[PDB]
Design an enzyme around this catalytic site. Structure first.
Site, PDB file in Angstrom:
ATOM      1  N   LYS A  10       0.811  -1.226   0.000  1.00  0.00           N
ATOM      2  CA  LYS A  10       0.000   0.000   0.000  1.00  0.00           C
ATOM      3  C   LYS A  10       0.843   1.275   0.000  1.00  0.00           C
ATOM      4  CE  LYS A  10      -4.041  -2.200   1.939  1.00  0.00           C
ATOM      5  NZ  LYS A  10      -4.999  -2.195   3.034  1.00  0.00           N
ATOM      6  N   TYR A  50     -12.753  -2.284  -4.194  1.00  0.00           N
ATOM      7  CA  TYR A  50     -13.330  -2.289  -2.853  1.00  0.00           C
ATOM      8  C   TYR A  50     -14.833  -2.078  -2.858  1.00  0.00           C
ATOM      9  CZ  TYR A  50      -8.618  -1.959  -1.034  1.00  0.00           C
ATOM     10  OH  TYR A  50      -7.309  -2.258  -0.687  1.00  0.00           O
ATOM     11  N   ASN A 113      -2.401   0.117   6.760  1.00  0.00           N
ATOM     12  CA  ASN A 113      -1.945  -1.140   7.348  1.00  0.00           C
ATOM     13  C   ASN A 113      -0.944  -1.832   6.443  1.00  0.00           C
ATOM     14  OD1 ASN A 113      -3.842  -1.829   5.532  1.00  0.00           O
ATOM     15  ND2 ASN A 113      -4.949  -3.246   6.892  1.00  0.00           N
ATOM     16  N   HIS A 116      -2.223  -5.524   1.741  1.00  0.00           N
ATOM     17  CA  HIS A 116      -3.501  -6.218   1.586  1.00  0.00           C
ATOM     18  C   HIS A 116      -3.205  -7.646   1.193  1.00  0.00           C
ATOM     19  CE1 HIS A 116      -7.502  -7.110  -0.079  1.00  0.00           C
ATOM     20  NE2 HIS A 116      -6.819  -7.794  -0.971  1.00  0.00           N
ATOM     21  N   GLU A 127      -9.924 -11.141  -7.013  1.00  0.00           N
ATOM     22  CA  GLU A 127      -8.970 -10.042  -6.873  1.00  0.00           C
ATOM     23  C   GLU A 127      -7.790 -10.130  -7.827  1.00  0.00           C
ATOM     24  OE1 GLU A 127      -7.850  -9.717  -2.770  1.00  0.00           O
ATOM     25  OE2 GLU A 127      -9.876  -9.007  -2.183  1.00  0.00           O
TER      26      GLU A 127
END
Lengths: 140, 140
Positions: A10, A50, A113, A116, A127
């Site tokens: 990320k 998302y 975070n 993913h 995905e």
């Protein structure tokens, strides 16, 4: 059995220039990188990925964060890769992640975070198909 | 003197799953990964990139090797990134490469160098253009 899962480094992690350190966790753990690319997610791309969170109160900040800077999307392949990637990453919320996991060591908030990972075989397939054409996934 | 350069992690390095370790060298040296993708170079893609060496007698072996498995093509950016990247890789021949450079630490032989880096500012612009659109490079 050997599996494929989607993994994303990320914007927070990529901006910390810790891409190498993170890729080394996956590799040292037995996972192979079989596809990867760096890109800046469009609004549409981030929202389409998302989509299932369209109605949650964090959707706007998620899409904002996930589009705030470049990321690395990739496919990891290995024995039991999907569950293995989850154990490597640790709990979604870095405060609940055990010491030594990617999230406990690299993240700031449940938003930023660091990485993913797909959370099931059904979501993995969905995905991977979102970011990569089959002919982009380089077997080895 | 902030510049951009083409870096390639070669089929031997990729096959060893040391992508992250190689990447961490660049990152810890101050360089930023601003573009990247894993590809399986086709014959024509390799021949295209190495068009200059088409008349040479090793041409066959080079292309053969560079298409023998997946690679990671990328652009590194930062202070004299071109010269800096060449320091990190070390001598083209691993045997003569100094301790602590990529090729000395990771490469088996002159054949399987582990890594490629642009030799000059002019060949950088050429090499980067060959693999990436400007729209894929994300300076940060």
């Amino acid at each position: 059995a050997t599996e494929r899962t989607l993994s994303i480094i990320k914007p927070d992690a990529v901006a910390k220039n810790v891409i190498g350190e993170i890729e080394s966790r996956f590799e040292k753990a037995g996972l192979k990188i079989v596809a990867a690319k760096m890109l800046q997610l469009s609004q549409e791309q981030a929202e389409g990925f998302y989509a299932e969170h369209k109605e949650r109160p964090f959707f706007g900040d998620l899409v904002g964060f996930m589009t705030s800077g470049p990321v690395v999307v990739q496919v990891l392949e290995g024995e039991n890769a999907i569950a293995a990637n989850r154990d490597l990453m640790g709990a979604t919320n870095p405060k609940e992640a055990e010491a030594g996991t990617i999230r406990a060591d690299y993240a700031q908030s449940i938003d930023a975070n660091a990485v993913h990972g797909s959370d099931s075989p059904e979501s993995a397939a969905r995905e991977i198909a979102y970011f990569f054409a089959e002919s982009e996934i380089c077997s080895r």
